Design a protein around this ligand. Structure first.
Ligand SMILES: [Ca+2]
Ligand SMILES: [Ca+2]
Ligand SMILES: [Ca+2]
Ligand SMILES: [Ca+2]
Ligand SMILES: [Ca+2]
Ligand SMILES: [Ca+2]
Ligand SMILES: [Ca+2]
Lengths: 301, 301, 301, 301, 301
């Protein structure tokens, strides 16, 4: 079966149609070739034979001075935007400006929604983890944070790609003049409007990137604080265990003294009880004295 | 209800007025459009139809060759600066230079105050934490440090945005000539003065950024030193606990020897006390000898 | 023995030949010198006397307006690509475009295969390690991850070299015109096609580099999470050991009390059993009371 | 009281004078304004009305085609350099070259002295800390290292500022021609000499920055090595404590066996001593056998 | 004593001479001044009065259209290269190309030898350390690794300096034309050959820098893996010690029960042996039951 594109076409007035067209017929209808409608890059903006070709992560659009086309829209939840919002936006400037503005606004809104969803989850997770009232932390939250950080890195990469793609065009005036496809097809400055649009969208992308960077540095700082808190708790626990070990060692020393003195033989002291009381008191007090001296030795350190 | 701007207007002589004006009426009065007075960016400097538009984090100003306007000043604690200082500053160069200088000076002073407030708190907290006389540290101070670091990152982002916005204009002479709105409206070099102003403010922002970077690297170094101190304390505590365990093990070994020799049976040695004294001395001395040998074994490591 | 190149030659029609030729004879046949056919760089693209010289990590190609040559193809598993695919690709544009496209596509496919092989192994290893259900992790997996990370770094370096080499040419139009060797040899725009090819391959390389960077940051985050999990497990284990030590210390204290009271002498209390029961109950209950108080003391911390 | 500058003036022949002059009188004497002699930047180099203005961290100089002036030299330990060295340096090229060379050489020598003082202290401290023969390290040395690192960061910032300030001028020829104040005041190439001077000083600053970067990376590596050594010592100590605990557990198990067999009741075995000897030997040997088996179990791990 | 240079002179034919010449006489013989032959930079390439001046870390060369001079060659192990190899290299292009190629090749070979010596030592040390079969690692190897890393950082700095110095010249055509000293002294393109030489050497330096960067990242990854392995071993050791402590606590609890029941008083149970056997079995079994329950409690965590 020959390959076919699932195309949806928008007119200047906002009329909407949808069908499936073979690639060869689509090439013949336009002045393009299969070399162009390949979509080998994640993000791309290009001009060929007075036809604009734009592609995003999952969006593919072709702009013509009299119509717009979107390709491969199936199973992408684009129906609400396609059949409810885009016609309203497209309904004195040429069609190209409106189409470009609509597509860029859609992409920017998608990125903004992604960031707004990501931010509160990470903030809440970090606030919960940083709680210094617990000597341990959960791990499902750690896994969630790892996944959200991976998503944040992907979002940052996408934003950087968007910024680079826009900047590559904003630098050269040749591409800016090329985008004025209507002027060339059928010969107030278009260049100023295009520059304003691109600058606005680039600034928005820059703001999003700055926010993402702030979030990442916050994550790193939270990780460091968590490490410090865990280390402090470890040190406190070891101090307590050490002190108890000191007391136990002294107590066991005196207990050995007592039991060894309690040999199951003849010592010639079995006829005196005052001696037994004296040795009992001796062990009981000496344990405390040695314990206090050893605590002082620990303290001097 | 139609949207309205809460506007305050300053004249050349310093006269001050304040009112509320609908957006459509404001557009009609000027030569601008709703496309411009949108304020979609955190920071922006632009020129349209010989009218300057400037925006900061929460400040919105429009400069006209004969007047200045500030929008959305309510609930922002700007009354003292608006009605007490700005008229004095505005009271031979055109109005645009004075207005731009006043606004830039206000922003720079705000950033300087933020940095001056942030610095001593972080310095004191780090000095308190680095104290090597304690095996543990507080956690409320850690939370305060985390919050202050987040604020520092935000301040650095704002400073970078300011620097980039100023540099984007300082590079091109077209925008510099555009800023001379009075010359174009009603046709000594203005460009030199504008360049001097922008360079001065850019240098101040660079100094602030350098200070913030120094603070951040200091924070990182303090964190590393804290980690090292905690590790050293842990090692010392483990050494002490180990030594006490060695002594306890030897002592318990000899105590087992004694108790096992003290079986509740007939051994045929119950008629000798010298033997009991000999075994008591044997355990008492051998404990010390084994303890010393084991300490030597630990030391050789 | 004079040095010789193992050369394989492809014609415009796709005809294939292979032989061995001495370096001096090869230089004489062409208009080049030994200074050029040295291959001292890992990656290189150059033009000399209307002859293109290209080199990769292990590939060496010379492009002539009427033929293509590949050098040192032995023991490199290139037979399948050389004798099965390249002739089909070479079978209206000149030969140079086809040859360059084929070689660049080969290199890009090799890099893509490398990355696709590397990704799943690292992902699976990290998923296995991050499992928070174990207090310890394997080490053979760690060694495998280290080796794969080294390979990833090498791949990133190669991708960066490719991007830099392509960009160095894309910037200057002189080299672009030079690549049109057929036009100069025997005097629609070639420059546009060359620019399109180079831009496409550069964008593909950029995508690969972005993917590698994402993988590296994921590795770092996984390492940090592993550290945190290990620290938490350590803290929990120390808490348990501490509590058991507290109980043991109290129990041993009361046991010492009992044994010391059980001296092998005359105390004048051997005629009372109620006293023995009372002391037994006293130790048994006091152990629990002291243990509970000490647990409360631990909890307050 | 009107503000006054403490000025010291150097003539072409090297004559030296010093006095205090009001700012208004100083402005009137020159062709400058208060806008210029403000000194709002840490480092600055500028030209105004054929007068050079230079400022460093604490140095302020004004160069005139016939004289040099230094401002605010009090309480700065500049007397030795001012009244002993500068006249000798100033005693065929114009005065501006000599003055600029002297000031730049002074600043470079100051930075070199700072770096030479900082280096040996850090090197010695790191060498002392890295000593792997100790399980713990001092903390006063850590504080000293932290302070020295802060100073190093400040020095790096100053060097970077110097480099940027020089480069900003070296790029544009307009400023280079402006620095030839004598030529403009009273109309062999001056530009070549200025370029040589600036390039030399920039290269020296670059060398200093490289040295500082090397020192910083050395510090980081030393920190990592310290962490590794502490971790290894911790592991060794825990191994020893574990082994001793294993032995103690076995010994206490057999001691419990013995004491429990030594109940203070009637067992019907009190008439046999061979049994007592057998049980004593049994415990004594079984302790060792269990200890060896448990050590083997530890080793297999 | 007046300063003197230890000079060695090479002629076009390869003739070699060596002597000592005073600086003033050397300046008079050439068209240079003491300002040039100062050698204040670690690396430098410059042209003055149709004379080339080049300096490396410890090499100082002056190129003249008819001769070459090397200064301060004593105590530097340069005899083998000076009197055995350089004449062969110098024996249709002018002398300058040969001299520059020889010097650059010497420097590149030195750097390559340094890197080739450094690599295997670091690789072997890291392979030995990463061995996960040991719970501890040596420290002399750590010191060796630290020293080798310092040397690697120095080598990277030198390579970067070389690259920057070459690039500074490759950018501007004025310096390229200046290097053609023979053409200017006594008026096929020299510029092409110079560009080829500089590009080749720059690419070689870039390859060396990439290799060094790969080595550094490998070192960092190895450090992280070492940390992880040590942490895992610590956790395993703590688990074992914890389990043994649990068993010991239960055993000591039951031993206390037994000894306390064995009071040296009258209990009225001394006439029953079945009771003694029952209590012995009770303690012996209950120890195991409690131990198993506590192990289950540990496992559930
Ligand atoms: Ca992606
Ligand atoms: Ca640690
Ligand atoms: Ca903000
Ligand atoms: Ca490689
Ligand atoms: Ca007894
Ligand atoms: Ca400073
Ligand atoms: Ca060096």
């Amino acid at each position: 079966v020959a390959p076919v594109f699932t195309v949806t076409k928008f007119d200047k007035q906002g009329n909407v149609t949808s069908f499936e067209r073979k690639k060869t017929e689509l090439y013949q209808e336009l002045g393009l070739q299969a070399r162009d409608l390949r979509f080998q890059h994640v993000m791309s903006i290009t001009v060929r034979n007075n036809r604009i070709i734009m592609r995003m992560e999952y969006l593919k659009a072709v702009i013509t001075p009299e119509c717009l086309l979107i390709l491969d829209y199936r199973n992408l939840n684009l129906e609400q935007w396609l059949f409810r919002e885009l016609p309203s936006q497209l309904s004195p400037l040429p069609f190209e400006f409106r189409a470009i503005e609509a597509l860029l606004q859609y992409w920017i809104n998608t990125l903004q929604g992604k960031l707004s969803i990501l931010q509160p989850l990470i903030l809440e997770t970090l606030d919960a983890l940083v709680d210094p009232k617990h000597s341990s932390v959960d791990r499902s939250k750690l896994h969630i944070l790892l996944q959200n950080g991976k998503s944040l890195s992907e979002l940052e990469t996408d934003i950087k790609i968007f910024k680079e793609s826009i900047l590559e065009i904003l630098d050269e005036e040749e591409l800016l003049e090329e985008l004025c496809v209507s002027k060339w097809s059928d010969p107030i400055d278009h260049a100023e409007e295009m520059e304003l649009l691109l600058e606005n969208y680039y600034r928005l992308a820059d703001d999003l990137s700055n926010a993402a960077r702030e979030l990442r540095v916050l994550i790193d700082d939270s990780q460091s604080i968590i490490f410090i808190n865990l280390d402090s708790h470890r040190n406190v626990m070891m101090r307590l265990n050490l002190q108890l070990t000191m007391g136990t060692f002294s107590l066991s020393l005196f207990g050995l003294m007592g039991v060894a003195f309690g040999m199951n033989l003849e010592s010639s002291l079995e006829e005196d009880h005052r001696i037994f009381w004296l040795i009992t008191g001796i062990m009981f007090m000496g344990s405390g004295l040695i314990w206090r001296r050893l605590l002082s030795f620990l303290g001097r350190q």
